[PDB]
Amino acid sequence: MQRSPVEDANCLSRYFFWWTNPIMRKGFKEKLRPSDVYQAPSQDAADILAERLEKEWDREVASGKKKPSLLRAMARCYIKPFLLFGFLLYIGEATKTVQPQLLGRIIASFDPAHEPERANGYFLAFGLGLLFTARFLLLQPAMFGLHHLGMQIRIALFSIIYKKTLKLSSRVLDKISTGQLVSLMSANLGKFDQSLGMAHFIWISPLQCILCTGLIWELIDVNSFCALAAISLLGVLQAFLSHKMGPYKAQKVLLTNKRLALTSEIMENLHSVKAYGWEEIMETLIKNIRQDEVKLTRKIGSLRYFYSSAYFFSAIFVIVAAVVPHALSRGINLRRIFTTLSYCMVLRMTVTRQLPGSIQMWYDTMRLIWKIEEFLSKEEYKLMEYDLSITELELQDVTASWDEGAPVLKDISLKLKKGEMLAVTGSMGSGKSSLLMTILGELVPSSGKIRHSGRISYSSQTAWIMPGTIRDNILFGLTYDEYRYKSVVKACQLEEDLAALPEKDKTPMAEGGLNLSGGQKARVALARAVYRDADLYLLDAPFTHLDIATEKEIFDKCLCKLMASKTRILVTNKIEHLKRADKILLLHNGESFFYGTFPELQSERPDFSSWNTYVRYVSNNKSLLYVLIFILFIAAIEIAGSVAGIFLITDELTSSYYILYIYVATSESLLAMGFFRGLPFVHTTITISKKLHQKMLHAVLSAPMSVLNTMKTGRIMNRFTKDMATIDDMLPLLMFDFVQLTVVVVGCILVVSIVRPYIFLAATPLAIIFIVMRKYFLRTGQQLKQLETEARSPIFSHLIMSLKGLWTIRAFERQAYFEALFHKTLNTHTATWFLYLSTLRWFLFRADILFVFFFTLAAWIAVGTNQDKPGEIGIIICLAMLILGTFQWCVATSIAVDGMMRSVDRVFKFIDLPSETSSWPHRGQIEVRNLTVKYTEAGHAVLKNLSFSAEGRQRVGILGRTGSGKSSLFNALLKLVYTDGEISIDGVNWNKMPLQKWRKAFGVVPQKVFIFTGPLRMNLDPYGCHSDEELWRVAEEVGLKTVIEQFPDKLDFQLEYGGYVLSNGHKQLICLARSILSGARILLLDQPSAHLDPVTIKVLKKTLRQSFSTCTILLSEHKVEPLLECQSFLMMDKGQVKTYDSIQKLLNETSHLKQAISPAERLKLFPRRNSSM
Ligand SMILES: Nc1ncnc2c1ncn2[C@@H]1O[C@H](COP(=O)(O)OP(=O)(O)OP(=O)(O)O)[C@@H](O)[C@H]1O
Ligand SMILES: Nc1ncnc2c1ncn2[C@@H]1O[C@H](COP(=O)(O)OP(=O)(O)OP(=O)(O)O)[C@@H](O)[C@H]1O
């Protein structure tokens, strides 16, 4: 990307935006790409703004205040431009205050007498033009500069909070939810930048209004005292309505946050939710809180209507309060009423528009500043000091607990030398991870000293994968090597299956490694830890998804031979690992039973324990069209009354002009939308949003997996978060306001033109010139905006991803790397945003300069060919001056509404997203022949020529090497992937049946468990069509009853996503309980014994096999002891399945990839008949 031309440019160029010319011209001809857009300017880059603000905050915190404030630190580095651009806004708006007099002098000097003055018109008219043009010359650069400042504020705050959250402690990290932290940023991103202009009026409006009322006080009469009182009542009425919005608006945002949290859950675990068949249920779950939300929006909109309507209706009321009282005292003045009128309106504008919008921001921003200040002042993580003098780890009397400092760990003692491996072991929730967390330095111990050498590696229990390549995750910062890398891949047994992929290496992985298998994520995450050089290695249960063979090989080659002379701590429950290892550690409820060698354990007493966009929008709701006709017809007859109404006065009455000023001044109220006229528009434009949301959610949730796995979570979520909240909240009032301003201006321009026709002559040429200039901007800008909104998604997806696997980032000390990566994703965004914002200012500035030509040629053409002896064509200068003052505000909306309307197309893409359009037999007979499955169309084959059969209600066993396709078979059976064959059930297939009914036949328990936010009632049965004792029966049946009884509100216990409330094993136990209640013939089981103890499986199988009495089951496990119960067996090979009756046949037919792998305990029972001859 070439450097930004803004730096290498003239002042005159940067002021008038001449540098923008090429990028517009290129955008006009052809379509733009992310390659085409410029680099960000060097002044407002990420690294400089962060380094700036942090210093002032550091010293402000370091000074030792009673309460450190962010404003005091912030103000010291942003005061200079704020006041400098602020001064221009004051002198700019102060221009208005002197308009009444200059306007008032020419209209005064119209009819004093015929002869005294000639020059007065032209001099003061040219002066009015000079004074007018001085304003927007003075005013426009201030806005741009002051916006651009707000961008520099927001980039610094995103940077410093990210730097903070990366070093935030684990005790407090669990308390803070991710959704609210993201949603805090997602709302502000755009709004906060643009909002500063309104906020600067907090001292402008009070200073101006006192000077304004001081000048209108030149009216001695109490008449003036009556006139101003109309502004005060309106002003308090405005702020009164803003109060009533508060409790409704505040209560709604909370109710929104529930939905955005739930949509994030359902769409992250989108693979599982389809397999059960929970579309309409989830749609219903979303529809309730959605139904509750819209009810409040109606009230927020209805109050926000009168907020707008009271402003437009007040022109009639305010104007009569000046003139009619003055009729009592020294009546019908020559020129004082016009001055008074102009002072009355400019005052009204300030109280109605500026000051509420000013105190709107300051009241909002202080709470934002309070929360960030609170967030920056939280518990900080301590980095481990590295020193070489210590060579082996030392613990003594370690006691520790989460959120209290009963204890999690209690008085641990262990003494490990260099070049030794320890074996941690125990039951569910014994505290095996917490011991690693204390050694790691994440959890701080309360009473007990813990000492070690600094550098540590760590492999997590739930392995996570970065967005990039397999190489990137294995290397993970460190440089590439020839045989180091290869020895790790060879040792970790990741070489064969990696070669089998379509691309050899460097496969671009989706969110969380969905394109990789369950076991591969463990081995790649292992390899990561193996590849680096460190003193201590912590492997927290790496062999949970691996086979017996791969485990055996990895344990012999990788753990023993390759890591020889490295200290290891491995979590496991296998006799052979415990036997080979040096020292054992047996936890139980946070306290240790035994600590020593294996023969010493045996000598002890416990022997062995274990228009297209608009037409589609309007046509979605026909009720809005029946309103749209009403607005056009009434406005036309409202116009008809004014056209005819003037002539009645003009005929009775050269000097038929001063009434035209009052009409133009009074126009807004005459052409306003009444109570019956305006409210139906707001009602219909809400109801459309309720449907338009409900259509999208249904369309997105029912689509094929190849299309869904193409898209990331953020790309989808960005439609729900921003674009839906835009069309919900903002669009109704802006689309209301747009019609008003067009009807007023177009209505007014026609009727002022009908009198004195040749004023129309000036407007014909440039209006079309203006419309061309708009179409010139809209081609390049609107297109550039869509790039900016896509550039928003990588920020939050990078933020939220960082919080999931933060524990590793700390272990590998890669925090600075992620900051650098985070700034790159910002700089690409701000480049786009800065460019777009500049191209808007070009158009906005060109709109004003274009206005000067209309004005002067209207002045030049409107002139006496003969002697204009009344003169004062200046009054036409005055009529044009005021009417087109609001035209800038009318245009200002035109860009906002149109650009914001293009967010609707993004929804319309998702609505039109490609999708798929007797008693079911007790006989659970299933056969498959010549099946072939593929994930991506026109890609590689995962299965090829698969053929097998299962007997009616028979127990079948599936085996195979890790990454053979055991899950993909279940995806093929359930139709989540492309297939070529004929799967049969009772001599029936999908020829007649739809997918819905085909899905209800099965009972799934997937690899990845899915437990969403809500109570256990909603988890165990989302429909809600079961008895309590029926739920208690299955809780006893599964072997999950007691652990529920220990909780408060036993069955209505608030269960969060992730967390620590239930252990991993319990999440499987829940996932089984789903399939109990499902009531299906066929059951698909993808590794039930994942994080289950040997003790739990025996008590499971005892009671579980009487529940599943009359139903077929398809198991797929690496553990043998759960598997050996079932009848038939089938193994998965390179291509296809080959079947066997018994284990004796299976293991002997298999070529010692399982026979020589199973331990002496199964070789006790297996060779019993041969050896016991
Ligand atoms: N990060 C955490 N924050 C707060 N509490 C936690 C955290 N991790 C675990 N806990 C709680 O403390 C207990 C410690 O058990 P822990 O999960 O360490 O045992 P474990 O052997 O790692 O579990 P598993 O057998 O599932 O691997 C858990 O039962 C849980 O309730
Ligand atoms: N979502 C996916 N998209 C594309 N390819 C996939 C996907 N999931 C798996 N694969 C491919 O299929 C192979 C293994 O499939 P699968 O995950 O069904 O095996 P598995 O038996 O479930 O693995 P494990 O035994 O580790 O659980 C891998 O080599 C992988 O490339």
Ligand SMILES: [Mg+2]
């Ligand atoms: Mg654990």
Ligand SMILES: [Mg+2]
């Ligand atoms: Mg699998």
